[PDB]
Amino acid sequence: APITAYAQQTRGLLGCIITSLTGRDKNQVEGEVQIVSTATQTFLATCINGVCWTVYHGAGTRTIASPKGPVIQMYTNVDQDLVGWPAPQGSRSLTPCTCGSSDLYLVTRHADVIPVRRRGDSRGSLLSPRPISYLKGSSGGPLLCPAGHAVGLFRAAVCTRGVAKAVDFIPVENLETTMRS
């Protein structure tokens, strides 16, 4: 089956803020990618193999709000630009790619899956470029191989004149590495 996805907003501005301070999220969790938010920005956190990874330059060394209060990160790595918490009770996890496909797909914050041709360990070419405003909020999102397995996490956009031609990502390997370090 083809990679399809949808998005559901679970909470608004005020509830988010309260929860940010309160540190206790009582809502139910579903999905492989959580739409994450801080006080400053919003992005994505992908659940790969029991852990909920996101981009460090967004989560920082913050804690994720859970029903049992704040949850301390289980992985932080300023250099690999990664952080990770135990996947929230309810989510479903993706598994890493094992086909070395170079035809990847990026699931965006708007639940749109767009193609990116792998051009190296951390780059890929948007077969059909998009403006950066579109890609905003998609950091920490997944890069799936044709089989739907995690190849990487969207990190930055390779843009010029406000239009993203390519994308820079974090290979699943750096997660595994970050895990053992």
Partner: peptide, 22 residues
Amino acid sequence: KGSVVIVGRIVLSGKPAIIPKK
């Protein structure tokens, strides 16, 4: 430093379905 809060979700596990009527 506030906690990161989940404000939404993206679901990939959904497979085509015939939107039910209510």
